[model samples]
Target: VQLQESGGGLVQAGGSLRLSCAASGGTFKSGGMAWFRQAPGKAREFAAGISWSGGSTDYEDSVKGRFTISRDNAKNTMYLQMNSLKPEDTAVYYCAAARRFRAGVVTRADDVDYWGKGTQVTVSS
Candidate 1:
């Protein structure tokens, strides 16, 4: 199950947007999905994640609270709900299908291969 970013949203700080990342092709329930962001001229940061296997959620300390990651196994899709948007929230968003390796750890595919051109989010009035 591959993931594709969706919902090219333009919103402002102090609001919320269903800035989404959707899984495609096949049922993604066997694995997990995650969200990452790259702010302009800045580094990439782990945004949020949902383990499709157990239906649990994970968030990076830097990305806590303001972002929510959820999935619909029945639809084999995952989505992002961004809350309390701030100026710092503008960035290119990425999503990927996480695979469980032989070591039994589930993580996004190796950094280079799994990512495609990301979805652009412009946060302003």
Candidate 2:
């Protein structure tokens, strides 16, 4: 599957930003998607994510209060909504997809296989 992330370019501090990831070329309901961020000169951070089919979600403790992950199966898209943005939140955000697999017995979907190009979000005054 292929993911494409899209959202706003500039947002004021204390405002909100909504990002969307569209999936194509494969099954989106079987696997899951995750949202990750990378600040300038910093490493990547897992923000929030969801299981497309199960409707379960996992979030980073730091962003749990303000980040929401959701999906629209009809549109083949996943969404991330973040509120109370800050300058420190300026980063390139991306979405990744993972699939479940069974190795004779156990099945899990924890490995990220594909990533979007990323959307650069800039927070300013």
Candidate 3:
């Protein structure tokens, strides 16, 4: 499967930002859709994820209460919405399709089959 990341640009500090990612060339709802990010001078971090197995969404502890992930099955698209945007949130974001589901696990973590080119967004006044 292939992912296309979009809807990234300038975002108001202390406001909100929503990103878009669409999947194609494979089974869209068979695996989870995930968002990952890289802040300037910082290592990569997971933003949010929506599990395909059961449609449950999860976020990293750092952003548990700050971000949300959702999807549209008809469009094969997913979204990541960030609230109370901060300068620390400025980064190049990417989308991935999860793979390697473990037995008995409800969510897919870490393993991805394909990745998007990435979208760069900045937070400022």
Candidate 4:
């Protein structure tokens, strides 16, 4: 599977930004997608993600209120919406195709196999 992230490059500090990722070569409705962000000089942060199969979502505590993760299975796309943006939110964001397991499979191995070429967003005043 492959993922491609696309979105605007600039966003005002108090505004919002919408980013999207298109998936191909795999069943997006089964595997889901994950969103991550890396600040200019910091480690990568897990923002939020959604399960395409059931439309369930998960998020980091820090961004739960300001971030929303969703998917459109018909379009094989995933979306990230960030509100109340701030300068510190400037970062390179990536979308990754997540791995799915069969029911009743007791495994702790879960990782993203394919990652998009990240999109950079700069939040400024």
lDDT of each: 0.66, 0.76, 0.75, 0.75
What clash pairs does model 3 have?
A: none
Candidate 1 vs 4: which has more lDDT: 4
Q: Whose TM-score is higher: candidate 1's or candidate 3's?
A: 3
- Model 3 off-target regions past 4 Å? 25-30, 99-110
Q: Per-prediction TM-score, please?
A: 0.77, 0.84, 0.82, 0.83
Error of 3 at 94 (Å): 0.4
For model 4, state the Cα shift of residue 49 in Å.
Answer: 1.4
Could you give candidate 4's per-residue lDDT for residues 15-94 as a string of tens digits?
A: 99999998884543237667888887776677786665634778878788998887777778888999999887788998
**Which pairs of residues collide in model 2?**
none
- Candidate 4 has its poorest 10 consecutive residues by lDDT at 100-109
Candidate 3 per-residue lDDT over residues 4-112, each given as its tens digit = 9988789899898889898874543326778888887776577787776435777877778889888776677878889998888889998877653531212333476
Q: After superposition, which runs of candidate 2 have C-alpha atoms over 4 Å from their true positions?
A: 25-30, 100-110
User: What is the per-residue lDDT of model 2 for residues 37-106, given as tens digits with 9 covering 90 to 100?
Assistant: 8887776678887775635888878778888888776777888899999887788998877743411111
Off by over 4 Å in 1: 27-30, 100-113
lDDT of 1 by residue, 1-125 (tens): 45677775688778887856555555322365677788878766677766655357878775588777887766656678888887777889887665433222224445322453588877885
By TM-score, rank the candidates, best first: 2, 4, 3, 1
lDDT of 4: 0.75
lDDT score at residue 25, model 4, on the 0-100 scale: 43
On TM-score, the leading prediction is 2
